[PDB]
Amino acid sequence: SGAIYVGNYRVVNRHLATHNDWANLVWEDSSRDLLVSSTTAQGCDTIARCDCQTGVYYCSSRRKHYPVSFSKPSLIFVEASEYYPARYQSHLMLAVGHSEPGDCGGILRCQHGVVGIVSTGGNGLVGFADVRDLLWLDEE
Numbered sequence: 001s002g003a004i005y006v007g008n009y010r011v012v013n014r015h016l017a018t019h020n021d022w023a024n025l026v027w028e029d030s031s032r033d034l035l036v037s038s039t040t041a042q043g044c045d046t047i048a049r050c051d052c053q054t055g056v057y058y059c060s061s062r063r064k065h066y067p068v069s070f071s072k073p074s075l076i077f078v079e080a081s082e083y084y085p086a087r088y089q090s091h092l093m094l095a096v097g098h099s100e101p102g103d104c105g106g107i108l109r110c111q112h113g114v115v116g117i118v119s120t121g122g123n124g125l126v127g128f129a130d131v132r133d134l135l136w137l138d139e140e
Protein backbone atom coordinates (compact mmCIF):
# COMPACT_ATOMS: atom_id res chain seq x y z
CA SER A 1 0.00 0.00 0.00
CA GLY A 2 0.90 3.67 -0.33
CA ALA A 3 -0.01 6.98 -1.93
CA ILE A 4 1.44 10.28 -3.08
CA TYR A 5 -0.19 13.38 -1.50
CA VAL A 6 0.45 16.44 -3.74
CA GLY A 7 -1.70 19.54 -3.26
CA ASN A 8 -5.34 18.33 -3.05
CA TYR A 9 -4.55 15.11 -4.99
CA ARG A 10 -4.07 11.54 -3.82
CA VAL A 11 -2.14 9.31 -6.27
CA VAL A 12 -2.62 5.56 -5.78
CA ASN A 13 -2.21 2.38 -7.69
CA ARG A 14 -5.46 2.00 -9.68
CA HIS A 15 -5.79 -1.63 -8.43
CA LEU A 16 -5.74 -0.40 -4.76
CA ALA A 17 -8.13 2.56 -5.28
CA THR A 18 -10.99 2.64 -2.72
CA HIS A 19 -14.69 3.38 -3.29
CA ASN A 20 -13.98 6.86 -1.81
CA ASP A 21 -11.22 7.30 -4.44
CA TRP A 22 -13.61 6.39 -7.33
CA ALA A 23 -16.34 8.63 -5.74
CA ASN A 24 -13.84 11.57 -5.87
CA LEU A 25 -12.12 10.61 -9.16
CA VAL A 26 -9.82 13.16 -10.89
CA TRP A 27 -8.15 10.83 -13.46
CA GLU A 28 -7.40 7.10 -13.91
CA ASP A 29 -5.47 4.98 -16.46
CA SER A 30 -5.51 1.12 -16.26
CA SER A 31 -2.52 0.93 -18.71
CA ARG A 32 -0.44 2.93 -16.13
CA ASP A 33 -1.98 1.32 -12.97
CA LEU A 34 -2.69 4.88 -11.70
CA LEU A 35 -5.67 6.63 -10.18
CA VAL A 36 -5.86 10.16 -8.80
CA SER A 37 -8.64 11.34 -6.38
CA SER A 38 -9.28 14.67 -4.47
CA THR A 39 -8.32 15.34 -0.80
CA THR A 40 -9.68 17.88 1.75
CA ALA A 41 -6.21 18.53 3.38
CA GLN A 42 -3.04 19.55 1.38
CA GLY A 43 -0.28 16.91 1.02
CA CYS A 44 3.41 16.87 2.17
CA ASP A 45 4.95 15.43 -1.13
CA THR A 46 6.67 17.28 -4.07
CA ILE A 47 6.72 15.72 -7.59
CA ALA A 48 10.11 15.37 -9.34
CA ARG A 49 10.32 17.15 -12.75
CA CYS A 50 13.39 15.56 -14.31
CA ASP A 51 14.84 12.55 -16.23
CA CYS A 52 16.77 11.02 -13.28
CA GLN A 53 17.49 7.28 -13.49
CA THR A 54 18.80 6.98 -9.93
CA GLY A 55 16.80 7.24 -6.75
CA VAL A 56 15.61 5.43 -3.62
CA TYR A 57 12.43 3.38 -3.14
CA TYR A 58 10.58 2.06 -0.12
CA CYS A 59 10.07 -1.73 0.05
CA SER A 60 7.38 -2.58 2.72
CA SER A 61 8.15 -6.35 2.50
CA ARG A 62 11.71 -5.48 3.83
CA ARG A 63 10.89 -2.35 5.96
CA LYS A 64 13.82 -0.85 3.91
CA HIS A 65 14.60 1.97 1.50
CA TYR A 66 16.90 0.79 -1.35
CA PRO A 67 18.97 2.98 -3.70
CA VAL A 68 18.32 1.88 -7.32
CA SER A 69 19.10 2.68 -10.92
CA PHE A 70 15.96 2.50 -13.07
CA SER A 71 14.97 2.57 -16.75
CA LYS A 72 13.12 5.60 -18.32
CA PRO A 73 9.29 5.24 -18.40
CA SER A 74 8.46 2.66 -21.20
CA LEU A 75 5.69 0.32 -22.51
CA ILE A 76 6.67 -3.06 -20.96
CA PHE A 77 5.18 -6.55 -20.90
CA VAL A 78 4.45 -7.60 -17.26
CA GLU A 79 3.83 -11.27 -16.21
CA ALA A 80 0.68 -12.17 -14.23
CA SER A 81 0.51 -11.02 -10.57
CA GLU A 82 -2.06 -11.54 -7.77
CA TYR A 83 -3.84 -8.27 -8.92
CA TYR A 84 -3.34 -8.25 -12.76
CA PRO A 85 -3.11 -10.74 -15.66
CA ALA A 86 0.01 -10.88 -17.89
CA ARG A 87 -0.31 -7.58 -19.91
CA TYR A 88 1.46 -4.46 -21.32
CA GLN A 89 1.81 -1.59 -18.82
CA SER A 90 2.74 2.00 -20.00
CA HIS A 91 4.93 4.67 -18.28
CA LEU A 92 6.70 1.87 -16.35
CA MET A 93 10.32 2.09 -14.98
CA LEU A 94 12.19 -1.09 -14.00
CA ALA A 95 14.99 -1.60 -11.45
CA VAL A 96 16.73 -4.60 -9.95
CA GLY A 97 15.18 -5.06 -6.53
CA HIS A 98 12.62 -6.78 -4.35
CA SER A 99 8.88 -6.23 -5.00
CA GLU A 100 5.91 -8.26 -3.80
CA PRO A 101 2.27 -7.28 -4.51
CA GLY A 102 1.82 -5.53 -1.11
CA ASP A 103 4.85 -3.30 -1.85
CA CYS A 104 2.73 -1.45 -4.42
CA GLY A 105 2.41 2.24 -3.47
CA GLY A 106 5.95 2.55 -2.05
CA ILE A 107 7.54 5.81 -3.20
CA LEU A 108 10.53 6.05 -5.56
CA ARG A 109 12.27 9.45 -5.02
CA CYS A 110 15.21 11.30 -6.56
CA GLN A 111 16.95 14.54 -5.59
CA HIS A 112 13.99 16.44 -7.23
CA GLY A 113 11.16 14.70 -5.22
CA VAL A 114 8.71 11.83 -5.87
CA VAL A 115 9.32 9.98 -9.19
CA GLY A 116 6.65 7.29 -8.96
CA ILE A 117 5.18 4.43 -6.96
CA VAL A 118 5.87 0.67 -6.91
CA SER A 119 3.47 -1.06 -9.36
CA THR A 120 5.11 -4.38 -10.46
CA GLY A 121 7.35 -7.10 -9.01
CA GLY A 122 8.72 -10.64 -9.56
CA ASN A 123 11.89 -12.20 -11.05
CA GLY A 124 14.10 -9.87 -8.99
CA LEU A 125 12.79 -6.65 -10.60
CA VAL A 126 10.66 -3.83 -9.18
CA GLY A 127 8.55 -1.70 -11.56
CA PHE A 128 7.46 1.86 -10.78
CA ALA A 129 4.59 3.80 -12.30
CA ASP A 130 6.07 7.18 -13.31
CA VAL A 131 4.19 10.38 -12.28
CA ARG A 132 6.79 12.98 -13.44
CA ASP A 133 4.96 13.59 -16.80
CA LEU A 134 1.74 14.55 -14.82
CA LEU A 135 2.45 18.29 -14.74
CA TRP A 136 -1.20 19.04 -13.86
CA LEU A 137 -0.55 17.42 -10.42
CA ASP A 138 1.37 20.69 -9.56
CA GLU A 139 -1.51 23.19 -10.32
CA GLU A 140 -5.34 23.78 -10.10
Ligand SMILES: O=c1ccncn1CCO
Nearest residue numbers: 059060061062063064065
Ligand atom coordinates in the same frame (compact mmCIF):
# COMPACT_ATOMS: atom_id res chain seq x y z
O1 LIG B 1 11.95 -3.00 11.58
C1 LIG B 1 11.79 -4.13 11.10
C2 LIG B 1 12.61 -4.75 10.11
C3 LIG B 1 12.32 -5.98 9.64
N1 LIG B 1 11.25 -6.73 10.06
C4 LIG B 1 10.52 -6.16 10.96
N2 LIG B 1 10.72 -4.92 11.50
C5 LIG B 1 9.86 -4.42 12.59
C6 LIG B 1 8.70 -3.59 12.06
O2 LIG B 1 8.10 -4.18 10.92
Ligand SMILES: [Zn+2]
Nearest residue numbers: 050052110112
Ligand atom coordinates in the same frame (compact mmCIF):
# COMPACT_ATOMS: atom_id res chain seq x y z
ZN1 LIG C 1 15.22 13.76 -10.40
